Amino acid sequence: MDVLYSLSKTLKDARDKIVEGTLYSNVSDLIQQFNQMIITMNGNEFQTGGIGNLPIRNWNFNFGLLGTTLLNLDANYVETARNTIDYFVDFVDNVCMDEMVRESQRNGIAPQSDSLRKLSAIKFKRINFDNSS
Amino acid sequence: PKESILKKLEDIKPEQAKKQTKLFRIFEPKQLPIYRANGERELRNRWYWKLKRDTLPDGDYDVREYFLNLYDQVLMEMPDYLLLKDMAVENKNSRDAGKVVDSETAAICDAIFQDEETEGAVRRFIAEMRQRVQADRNVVNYPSILHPIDHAFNEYFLQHQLVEPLNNDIIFNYIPERIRNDVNYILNMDRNLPSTARYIRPNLLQDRLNLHDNFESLWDTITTSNYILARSVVPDLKELVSTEAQIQKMSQDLQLEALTIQSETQFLTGINSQAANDCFKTLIAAMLSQRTMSLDFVTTNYMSLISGMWLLTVIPNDMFIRESLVACQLAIINTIVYPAFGMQRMHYRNGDPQTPFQIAEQQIQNFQVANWLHFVNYNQFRQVVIDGVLNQVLNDNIRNGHVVNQLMEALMQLSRQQFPTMPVDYKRSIQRGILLLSNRLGQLVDLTRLLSYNYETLMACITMNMQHVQTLTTEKLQLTSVTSLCMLIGNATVIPSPQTLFHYYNVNVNFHSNYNERINDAVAIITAANRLNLYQKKMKSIVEDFLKRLQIFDVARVPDDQMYRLRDRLRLLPVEIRRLDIFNLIAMNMEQIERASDKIAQGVIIAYRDMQLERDEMYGYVNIARNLDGFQQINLEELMRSGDYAQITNMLLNNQPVALVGALPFITDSSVISLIAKLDATVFAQIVKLRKVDTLKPILYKINSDSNDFYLVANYDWIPTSTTKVYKQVPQQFDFRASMHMLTSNLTFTVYSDLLAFVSADTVEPINAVAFDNMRIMNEL
Amino acid sequence: LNQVLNDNIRNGHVVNQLMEALMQLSRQQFPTMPVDYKRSIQRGILLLSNRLGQLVDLTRLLSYNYETLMACITMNMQHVQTLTTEKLQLTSVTSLCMLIGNATVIPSPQTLFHYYNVNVNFHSNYNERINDAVAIITAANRLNLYQ
Amino acid sequence: TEAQIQKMSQDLQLEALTIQSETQFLTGINSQAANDCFKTLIAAMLSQR
Prior knowledge:
The structure is cut from a larger assembly and holds 1 copy of chain A and 3 copies of chain B.
Chain A (H helix, E strand, L loop, with lengths): L1 H15 L13 H12 L3 E4 L8 E4 L14 H26 L13 H6 L14
Antiparallel strand pairs in A: 1-2
Helix pairs in contact in A: 1-2, 1-3
Chain B lengths: L4 H6 L16 E9 L5 E11 L8 H17 L12 E2 L8 E2 L2 H10 L7 H8 L4 E3 L4 E7 L2 H12 L4 E2 L2 H7 L2 H4 L4 E4 L9 E2 L16 H16 L11 H11 L20 H15 L5 E3 L5 H13 L7 H16 L18 H8 L4 H10 L7 E2 L2 E2 L5 H5 L1 H10 L12 H15 L2 H19 L16 E3 H8 L11 H33 L9 H10 L10 H11 L6 H18 L6 E12 L11 E2 L7 E3 H7 L6 H4 L5 E7 L2 E3 L3 H4 L8 H5 L9 E3 L9 H5 L5 E7 L8 H4 E6 L14 E4 L18
Parallel strand pairs in B: 10-13, 15-20, 16-17, 18-19
Antiparallel strand pairs in B: 1-2, 3-4, 5-6, 6-21, 7-9, 8-22, 11-12, 14-17, 14-20
PDB class: virus
Keywords: Rotavirus, dsRNA virus, virus
Entry title: SA11 Rotavirus Non-tripsinized Triple Layered Particle
């Protein structure tokens, strides 16, 4: 749950902060967290949906890291960032729709979907970011 | 002695494939005189299983140390392959004149035949001992006479064999992929290798020890040897422009006034033809061995600073120690870049977490100069895994050569500047060097492409992890040599010849397979010494020998703590399945090899009641006990260790039934009167008087008809009776038809080391030598 | 009376924390130290922090020798700050750190008895002399001898 | 002692730094430094010196 908020906070900030022409020092601490996120999420596969008419989608993460060598972010960096962000946003959208749809009488505060039970490991704990909402 | 460091690594001489020529038997059949139910002689002799030789000592610690010696003897007699047809000899007497597997098996067959009482049922079975040859399946079988422990060793040595079949596709796949799909190299063959052709593939498992973690002094020696090796493989620069004809053009570009003491004479210092291919070799070889460099410059030579700008263009900043790097960046910044915009001298504090490039990236208003400064700031390798090994691959824009076009577009902005606080002679002094570099735009783009292509092609033959840690001693790089590499490169492409590519790959695979097989040896010996309770063995000798046999390390200069720390992180590793199966055989049959000899007895039972001597066939009458059941055991070895002798004193002063358990000698008493005279309890008073049980030497009786004065047994109806009973096990009979087995192998094959001796190699002419982007390296006119 | 260590020094387990605190100082970047002196002081800490077991065992041995020789003490072990001090060189401590092996030295029982012999002899001497002194003083004062 | 002095002199380098070269390495004495330190420590602890 903490890492799901962290994924969404980094994707929100990386849609906000990583824009065309912005200075690198404005985004120098966000690109390191987004690269830590890519490094953590590679090699892992997920499966979302499977209840009602929510379709089963399989998620595979094989992405390269973002560059840390620009002074002002040009449009190449923005386009490859928008690709990686759109894939992760679709992933977290389907994980959130897989988690809001499930429930349990026994212990409801625990994650119920398979994807969020897989994200609740300490392998994914280095995704974690600020919890400000 | 940088030429004897090279000799230690060019002469690794890979693991010689050991063919078996014997069988590794531990036991042997020996015939003993046998006795009747009453001690009289049965008329025959009977063959038994005995040890071939014993060096089983008395202390149980020495016994388990002897089986560790036996384990190392097995490891030194493990066949890498075998051919059973090369050790098989004929038995003299079969029907079809067959072949048994051994000269010793033939000796047993010729001793059981032509012996008077073998019995017919056996002599017919020797005549049926014949090999069986399937030539279609390439499978032969030879008759063998082996003990079940010995047959466990031999069946293991047959079945788990190292050879793997070979063809031309495997020598295609033995060459690494980055040369195999390279356009520049053409590889053909001359020999179709047959269907029966084998090889033993090397052990290319990566660093299980992680010497780069904490062994800084050992991994310094490793990166030194990899550096001296890779330096000898980087090719010589061919067809540089003439030195005395480049110094003339260099001295025409800047106008040398003969009377003015000026800073442009010192631009022309040390530009040689041998410093150029000194610099080329060390820039590639320090980046192949992942070995940190250290800059040497004078700060008045400004062409050194401009060639340092190009040096920090191409090569990442993490290849240098921070002192020489940050001092060079300081001199570059203070000299050329900050007087351009009229800024402060920048008092830069030693110990700033940010390098002078990393604050010139934020103090400077220009885009172009600062854009190139930010390329240099966070220039680093990508940590890549291709073909199982780590690589540390450069940036793409470095290996395009495009980043020189990024630098020069940032360099012709420092010529547009006016230098508002500095005199005009200083302005000429900077932009003469700027002109002096920017005359060679395409030449440096092509030099960067050549450096990166040779870097790729030569790290395409590295089989170890290129772990990027800052090394210890951090050898020298001069910027005068970088300057004489910036100038004097010219036209001719040089790429490494595939003979030297194959040689570099061969010596990498030789040292790596050496290193892994040594790890397997030492982890097996340390695990075998830990799993057999060797509490007095100091394991500095194992790790010391482990660094002896690695032919690089100065082992007399590695003291205790590093040897013992290698012991600490070496026994965390699992043993190779071969030596683990060997130790499993040793550990399950060691307890039977120990109990199957004379000059050892595994305990003494002193009861003070009258226990009758037991009959068996090969002694007549013994005080052999066969279990320690019903008696209070006392471990002899622990006793020897702690040195108490107060429990056994209080059990030998008064007469309590007691059981001294431990390996011991014995004497063989044979006479009957010396059993009628109670010599049993005599040999245990010396434990009470002198406090040692290393003297302890019990007695085993053989009351037989071969003894003197046996008639007391025969005439008086006397089942003989002794006070004590030593603890031995009875030898096993040599069942001939159950000890014979059939050993299974291939008939013929051949073993080929040096797989790369069959590949004939060629390269494309270096005018048309092509890079990764399907464009030529060095496409200059 | 006896001055004893705690059991963390006594079995040498405390060095497993000093080396944990030392290789914390080795992965520690210093904010404004020059990098050559910083790398030198981090590797100088790593000279110590790689002798984990070699110094756990050394402070087991030192404490065991202190144990076996504290048993033969027969006077009090009073801790009072003395006037003159026995000067210790820390160079000798660096020598003891970086040069110890794994060979156990314990006092042999003849030099373990001889220490007890000379302690009991000095204590016997001390008490018998004090008895003689209070005898002569009390006798000289009860016999009215004031010169 | 010689392998120990060379290891301590190559791990911590002093020809690159500048305070001095040698006086840092009066350490590696076999018996007049380590053994006498062992004696000094245990004798002071036993005598409460």
